[PDB]
């Protein structure tokens, strides 16, 4: 069985959850353009 965590997966407590961007994710996002 999977267990706990699926619903909230991929959202970091110290970033997405506090609406803060790590120093380099921007580079990632921009690569999709």
């Amino acid at each position: 069985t999977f267990g706990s965590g699926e619903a909230d997966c991929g959202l970091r407590p110290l970033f997405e959850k506090k609406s803060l961007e790590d120093k380099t994710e921007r580079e990632l996002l921009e690569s999709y353009i």
Binding site: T1, G3, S4, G5, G10, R12, P13, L14, L28, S31
Partner: protein
Amino acid sequence: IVEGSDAEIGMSPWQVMLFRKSPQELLCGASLISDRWVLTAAHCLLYPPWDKNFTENDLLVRIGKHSRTRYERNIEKISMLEKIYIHPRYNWRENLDRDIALMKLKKPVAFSDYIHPVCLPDRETAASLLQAGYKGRVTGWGNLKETWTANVGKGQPSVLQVVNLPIVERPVCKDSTRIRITDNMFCAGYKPDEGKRGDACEGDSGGPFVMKSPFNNRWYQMGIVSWGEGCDRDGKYGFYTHVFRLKKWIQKVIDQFGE
């Protein structure tokens, strides 16, 4: 990680460290996908040509870390393994095809600001994000250089490293090496003409190659550090286990039992 940089605290809360009990040594990277499942590369646990073949009791896994060697009191969390599941068609004889493994913890871990799971991709996530030119992120406490030959600089970082790299066109990957490539693999890194640098290296295997969905803002693990030829060499690209191509096996194992 070659030509990467220090990670920020809690930047990769799904990062896991595969650690050998005795002697105490860091073996590989891994990733947290739930409170009781961890994903890593198969060769980290089983590689006959090098006499490698660990079992559940030989290892322990360490979650929430940043520093490679310090024991991070009140922050990190250590868990023993209940079971290890190597993909049954993991090809260690030739090219590491299906270089993937699932490890079940004995006791479910509690999440925290430093411990949180990454999402596994589905068909849409893969179609939309796994495209040549898009960038993903690799993390690990692996080597800062090819340590098997004389080179300047430290061998290991003191802190978790991170590097962003673009996915590369499959034909390029294929022509970059003489080792047989499969659809269960993808390669990533900069081309010589792009003038930028970065790659995973020995000790990084099992670590995740994650991508952020611009659509739902979540982090998805698309690959697993599997292999390479040298580290950060021009015309070479790091190879990663294709997670979504192996999703059926993964879910088959994770959902198998009601425990």
